[PDB]
Design a binder for this molecule. Structure first.
Ligand SMILES: OC[C@H]1O[C@@H](O[C@H]2[C@H](O)[C@@H](O)[C@H](O[C@@H]3[C@@H](O)[C@H](O[C@H]4[C@H](O)[C@@H](O)[C@H](O)O[C@@H]4CO)O[C@H](CO)[C@H]3O)O[C@@H]2CO)[C@H](O)[C@@H](O)[C@@H]1O
Ligand SMILES: [Ca+2]
Ligand SMILES: [Ca+2]
Length: 270
């Protein structure tokens, strides 16, 4: 009834599938993903109560030494749907067929109910991201003709990579009320093309619905990549990046009670 992963007990890369019907196809996949931490004291723990429906992340890390300061953040504990293209983990038991080529995909809403509690001014975000790859089922990383898209609905003390391009309006739902929100658009070349959308009014808790195609359509429009609509939307990842090169302790807790992807009857890109 309860799934738990823990760093450092489970190794360098704790992770597990959420497979509530035990059918061998996960609905979601969880990872602690401390990808830029070389060593730390303390622990990080992610639990998922299958019975009550709550994901709870608890982190108390100290003595943090990074693998590369130039990566800036320490890690990205997360839950995702689809095929994460950095490893052999995947979750495909859901209504949206990911991976699929962006030219063939439905638009969809993403709704998340959550609460964030970073401690002591820890720099964090709450970021949704997707990777867009040239092959359908990538498991060995990302190339320079591919894209990373993030959507930050909370942040404190972090800025996206690269340069600010523009601001856009995206209609979202916040705590049940539809509302025009503003997103900053940022773009970088970091070994692949990176496009980030950073809300101008961060939301530290509640229920938020976003239209995924509004973001992928702007990412397509501003891209420098050839043949963009041939790329595959591999996954949708939801997690909190945290830390800076100056951060040596990182205590954080969060909860997610619901993630829903709702297909629409319209193309992703418009
Ligand atoms: O699963 C076990 C296998 O793990 C392999 O290592 C993987 C690791 O699982 C995976 O989680 C890691 O992914 C990170 C990716 O989350 C991160 O994304 C960044 C992004 O680059 C950055 O631009 C944006 O700002 O933030 C994102 C979130 O913080 O990117 C880094 C690459 O820079 C990824 O490392 O990828 C690992 C491989 O690099 C082990 O290799 C394997 O042995 C093991 O069996
Ligand atoms: Ca399943
Ligand atoms: Ca994978």
């Amino acid at each position: 009834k309860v799934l738990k992963i823990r760093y450092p007990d489970d190794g360098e890369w704790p992770g597990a599938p959420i497979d509530k019907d035990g059918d061998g196809n996960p609905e979601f996949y969880i990872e602690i993903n401390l990808w830029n931490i070389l060593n730390a004291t303390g622990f990080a723990e992610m639990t998922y109560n299958l019975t009550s429906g709550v994901l709870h992340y608890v982190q108390q890390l100290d003595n943090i030494v990074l693998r590369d300061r130039s990566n800036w953040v320490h890690g990205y504990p997360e839950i995702f749907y689809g095929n994460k293209p950095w490893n052999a983990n995947y979750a495909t038991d859901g209504p949206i067929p990911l991976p699929s080529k962006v030219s063939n995909l439905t638009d969809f809403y993403l709704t998340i109910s959550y609460k964030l509690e970073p401690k002591n001014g820890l720099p964090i975000n709450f970021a949704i991201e997707s990777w867009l790859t040239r092959e359908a089922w990538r498991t060995t990383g990302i190339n320079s003709d591919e894209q990373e898209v993030m959507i930050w609905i909370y942040y404190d003390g972090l800025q996206p990579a690269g340069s600010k391009v523009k601001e856009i309006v995206v209609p979202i739902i916040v705590n049940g009320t539809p509302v025009n929100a503003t997103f900053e658009v940022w773009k970088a070349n970091i070994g692949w093309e990176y496009v980030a959308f950073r809300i101008k009014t961060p939301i530290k808790e509640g229920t938020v619905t976003i239209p995924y195609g509004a973001f992928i359509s702007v990412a397509a429009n501003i891209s420098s990549l050839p043949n963009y609509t041939e790329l595959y939307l591999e996954d949708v990842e939801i997690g909190t990046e945290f830390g800076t090169p100056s951060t040596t302790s990182a205590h954080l807790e969060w909860w997610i009670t619901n993630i829903t992807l709702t297909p629409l009857d319209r193309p992703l890109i418009s």
